[PDB]
């Protein structure tokens, strides 16, 4: 088996259109769980007044994805955002999507809600059949395959609170086994029906204060939050940017439990973690940071933390840093794994760990936190090195865990040819896209790899992207240039002067 | 290109004609109706 | 081990599937207690949760048990829980 690497990532998490804003919020210590009433009247049915929500759900470029207006109005917002996020993820890795056309890339998508389908299927007298092809759960992956022309598997997993990480595990297995050269792993969740929140509140899995206080004495529950993420898993040969390497992925169910189906278990999670880190051949002393589920439940937190302590903290001297991305944004049920993965990858790229929030005093039922073996990252801590681990556990008992080896590639040694002027070319749907690409190219004119990746994703036909531009970087002069590309292939002629 | 705005399901789009329950049980506010009996019938 | 209150708030698919899974194990001549604690996995293909729509249509009367019984991911998680399977539990939803 070859290596599996993560090439590109994109998403639209709470109070963050792109991942850059997500990181600015994570490291800036800004609570991304607002209390407004965009989705519905606050406090309706006694639901918590705070939830994680996106900035806008009404935006989708229909023309580029070949969706007519009638179809777009009946398409699930999850799908509309996921198409764009997937395209951004593919380009984020410096890979022109045209290359992946006709290959065996497989789309695995974790979804838990289909609330849009009910809304559009409530009036039999005046309901359109398009909604079946736009809101059906399977279409969340089949639509992506149809547009991007992927011949690989197209599955829409459903395991709760762990669907996205299960999809990542399945994609990792598919690539590792030689079945696919690349994969698109996505996780979507949108809060649209208050009745689901009422159900969760009745079960007792929601916090009245609406704040997920991970690893904290006053941990009541968790706050619902929406988000969309997508990751491009690929083998080594294809990858142009490598965020990390998937050293091993696994899964397993709790089994029978006297307490109940929804009661988390710790022995099973410990077994899963130990099995992964034994099969991969990675010693526990090499771990540096584990992204715990950290939903803030008064029962789940002790189980998960003590399982981690038993599995990894047995015979290691230095403490293990543990953090949860759910104190910063909330808890996107089906997308919990991918949000934590995005936070981890961003922290590794920027060389700093995103601080947790709402951490004042450690839970007295967790000896490791007091003993000092486990350290909650409540301040920006520079990364020293080592491996990482992400675990997402659903409330049905579906456990997942991953081990990541970060990218220790240093900047290249300066070379004589680096001083020669270089050319950057960009294409986009509107002039603002070309402007932003050219400005980014100018900002980092000394980073050759960034320019090369930008140039490798700029060969999009004029029909899809009718705006193009260029900017000779590092020259004696010359600003950016932008103009619309006339349609139709144009012949190229040569004339040799005498 | 995000010039156009598309449909997004609203809160009221999902399920959630006054109906009055008449109960004569002593624990209910309407217990006083027991005293309105005519021809040996409430 | 499903109490009467939760039996009413459970998807018919889940109940029929529990019965059919027990029947399938026995038809193979293998006692179900032989597979307890093993890495047996449960995969299910579902493309509908209309019971959840029927049970979550009254905000003032719904019981939280519906989520634990009618949720899509529980169609496999319930089987793994009862039969004590430690392997994967997934709910594929590729149509047809």
Swiss-Prot record, chain A:
Post-translational modification comment from the UniProt entry: In adipocytes, S-nitrosylation of Fatty acid synthase occurs under physiological conditions and gradually increases during adipogenesis.
Bridged cysteine pairs (disulfide): none
Residue numbers of Phosphoserine PTMs: 63, 207
Organs and tissues of expression: Ubiquitous. Prominent expression in brain, lung, liver and mammary gland.
Active site, renumbered: 161 (for beta-ketoacyl synthase activity), 293 (for beta-ketoacyl synthase activity), 331 (for beta-ketoacyl synthase activity)
Ketosynthase family 3 (KS3) domain span: 2-406
Subcellular location: Cytoplasm; Melanosome
Residues bearing the modification N6-acetyllysine: 70, 298, 436
Leftover remarks: The relatively low beta-ketoacyl synthase activity may be attributable to the low 4'-phosphopantetheine content of the protein.
Function: Fatty acid synthetase is a multifunctional enzyme that catalyzes the de novo biosynthesis of long-chain saturated fatty acids starting from acetyl-CoA and malonyl-CoA in the presence of NADPH. This multifunctional protein contains 7 catalytic activities and a site for the binding of the prosthetic group 4'-phosphopantetheine of the acyl carrier protein ([ACP]) domain.
Subunit record text: Homodimer which is arranged in a head to tail fashion. Interacts with CEACAM1; this interaction is insulin and phosphorylation-dependent; reduces fatty-acid synthase activity.
Name of the protein in its database record: Fatty acid synthase
Species for this entry: Homo sapiens
Source lineage: Eukaryota, Metazoa, Chordata, Craniata, Vertebrata
Range covered out of full length: 2 to 498 of 2511
């Amino acid at each position: 088996p070859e290596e599996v690497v993560i090439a590109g990532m994109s998403g639209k998490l709470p109070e963050s259109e792109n991942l850059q804003e997500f990181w600015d919020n994570l490291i800036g210590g800004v609570d991304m769980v607002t209390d407004d009433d965009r989705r519905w009247k606050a406090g309706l049915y006694g639901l918590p007044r705070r939830s994680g929500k996106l900035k806008d759900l009404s935006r989708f470029d229909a023309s580029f994805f070949g969706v007519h207006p009638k179809q777009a109005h009946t398409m699930d917002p999850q799908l509309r955002l996921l198409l764009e996020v997937t395209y951004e993820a593919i380009v984020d890795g410096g890979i022109n999507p045209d290359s992946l056309r006709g290959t065996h890339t497989g789309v695995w998508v974790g979804v838990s809600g289909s609330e849009t389908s009910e809304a559009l299927s409530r009036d039999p007298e005046t309901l359109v059949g398009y909604s079946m092809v736009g809101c059906q759960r399977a279409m969340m992956a089949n639509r992506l395959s149809f547009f991007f022309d992927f011949r690989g598997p197209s599955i829409a997993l459903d395991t709760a609170c762990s669907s996205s990480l299960m999809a990542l595990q399945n994609a990792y297995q598919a690539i590792h086994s030689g079945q696919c050269p690349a994969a698109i792993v996505g996780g979507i969740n949108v809060l649209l029906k208050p009745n689901t929140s009422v159900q969760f509140l009745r079960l007792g899995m929601l916090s009245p204060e609406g704040t997920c206080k991970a690893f904290d004495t006053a941990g009541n529950g968790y706050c619902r939050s929406e988000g969309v993420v997508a990751v491009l898993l690929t083998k080594k040969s294809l990858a142009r940017r490598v965020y990390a390497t998937i050293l091993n992925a696994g899964t397993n169910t709790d089994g029978f439990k006297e307490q109940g189906v929804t009661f988390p278990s710790g022995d099973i999670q410990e077994q899963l973690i130990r099995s992964l880190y034994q099969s991969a051949g990675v010693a526990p002393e090499s771990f540096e940071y584990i992204e715990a589920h950290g939903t803030g439940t008064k029962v789940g937190d002790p189980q998960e933390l003590n399982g981690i302590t038993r599995a990894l903290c047995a015979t290691r001297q230095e403490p293990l840093l543990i953090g949860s991305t759910k104190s910063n944004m909330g808890h996107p049920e089906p997308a919990s794994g991918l949000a934590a993965l995005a936070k981890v990858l961003l922290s590794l790229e920027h060389g700093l760990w995103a601080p947790n929030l709402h951490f004042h005093s450690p839970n007295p039922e967790i000896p490791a936190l007091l003993d000092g073996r486990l350290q909650v990252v409540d301040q920006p801590l520079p990364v020293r090195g080592g491996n990482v681990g992400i675990n997402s556990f659903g409330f049905g008992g579906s456990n997942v865990h991953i081990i990541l080896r970060p990218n220790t590639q240093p900047p290249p040694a300066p070379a004589p040819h680096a001083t020669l002027p270089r050319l950057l070319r960009a294409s986009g749907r509107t002039p603002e896209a070309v402007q932003k690409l050219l400005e980014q190219g100018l900002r980092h004119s000394q980073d050759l790899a960034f320019l090369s990746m930008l140039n490798d994703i700029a060969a999009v036909p004029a029909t899809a992207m009718p705006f193009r531009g260029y900017a000779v970087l590092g020259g004696e002069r010359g600003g950016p240039e932008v103009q619309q590309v006339p349609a139709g292939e144009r012949p190229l002629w040569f004339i040799c002067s005498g | 290109d995000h010039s156009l705005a598309w449909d997004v399901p609203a809160a009221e789009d999902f399920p959630n004609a006054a109906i009055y329950n008449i109960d004569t049980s002593s624990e209910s506010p309407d217990h006083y109706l027991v005293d309105h009996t005519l021809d040996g019938r409430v």
